[PDB]
């Protein structure tokens, strides 16, 4: 999923959910 | 900072709004890499007020051009500060002067 030729480090992850149903363990 | 300048660096740096400027004078009470606390002088307090100022800083945020925005404190513990003094630096700023 990382575009070819681009590296780096992960510093932030965001999760967006509406008023619906279901949720994940990481969320 | 530039060794050779014209004298307009402070105006640009302060009026841009990328730094942190003291609203009221006082004494530095607590400081770390991401927060500043100021204890306000006696003759600048409204009645019935605790009298502390808290400044939170921006840390590693991306701009519209995928660059970096970061603020850094430039005061020590127990220092006196007046009104309009620079408490933290923004991107491309050195002690309150523009530095590209």
């Amino acid at each position: 999923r990382v575009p070819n030729g681009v590296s780096g480090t992960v510093i932030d992850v965001q999760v967006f959910t509406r008023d619906g149903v279901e949720k994940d363990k990481r969320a | 900072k530039p060794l050779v300048g014209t004298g307009m660096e402070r105006a640009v740096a302060v009026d841009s709004g990328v730094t942190a400027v003291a609203k009221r004078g006082g004494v530095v009470q607590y400081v770390d890499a991401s927060r500043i606390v100021i204890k306000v002088n006696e003759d600048e307090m409204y009645p019935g007020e605790a009298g502390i100022d808290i400044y939170n800083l921006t840390k590693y945020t991306r701009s519209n051009q995928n660059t970096c925005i970061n603020q850094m404190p430039c005061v020590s513990l127990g220092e006196p500060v007046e009104r309009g003094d620079v408490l933290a630096d923004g991107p491309s700023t050195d002690l309150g002067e523009l530095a590209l």
Partner: protein
């Protein structure tokens, strides 16, 4: 068809990082030849020790902060990049640092080790601003020569730094006339050395001369 050979005649120590070396005597033209060869060799091929890795307890990456510490992790790494250490007997060592209370954290706070020497104890690393704050870290030191970026050489929480192994900072040289018995065509060569305090001038001169002599063997060919 015979030449006079030079020798070491004087070593003067201005301070712990500044030195002067004198070679005497020399024939016509040999001073500049030896001076330029030695200057070129001394600035690129000397060995040294440097910090290569670091680990801090609650730190995940270098783009973050720690509560009670005035600097960022990246500034701490940049500060650690300039620590000078003398090591004997090994090519790798690990040091531990622990500190608590309000104040500066210097190189004198590192746990003592039998065969490791720290030459500038007053070097500053970070500052603690809270009375209920503490720090603990582990630092890895290796030996080498040259300049190796971290990207070229390549768990979560282990941080790499760029390694600059060279202990030499500045080299200069001068050629002057010499006083010899009844002869007025001889010179002396003076070399001025500025380093970080982790190498001996006499040993450096001997090492450079050995490298040059070993490189000159291929030209006596068949």
């Amino acid at each position: 068809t015979e030449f006079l050979k030079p020798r070491l005649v004087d070593i003067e120590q201005v301070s712990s990082t500044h030195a002067k070396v004198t070679l005497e005597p020399l024939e016509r033209g040999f001073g500049h030849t030896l001076g330029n060869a030695l200057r070129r060799i001394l600035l690129s091929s000397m060995p040294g020790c440097a910090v290569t890795e670091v680990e801090i307890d609650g730190v995940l990456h270098e783009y973050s902060t720690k509560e009670g510490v005035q600097e960022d992790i990246l500034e701490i790494l940049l500060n650690l990049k300039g620590l000078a250490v003398r090591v004997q007997g090994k090519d790798e060592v690990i040091l531990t640092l622990n500190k608590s209370g309000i104040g500066p954290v210097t190189a004198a706070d590192i746990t003592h080790d039998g065969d490791v020497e720290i030459v500038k104890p007053q070097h500053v690393i970070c500052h603690l601003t809270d009375e209920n704050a503490s720090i603990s870290m582990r630092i890895k030191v290796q030996r080498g020569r040259g300049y190796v970026p971290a990207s070229t050489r390549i768990p979560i929480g282990r941080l790499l730094v760029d390694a600059c192994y060279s202990p030499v900072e500045r080299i200069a040289y001068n050629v002057e006339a010499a006083r010899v018995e009844q002869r007025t065509d001889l010179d002396k060569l003076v070399i001025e050395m500025e380093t970080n305090g982790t190498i001996d001038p006499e040993e450096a001169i001997r090492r450079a001369a050995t490298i040059l002599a070993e490189q000159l063997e291929a030209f006596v060919d068949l």
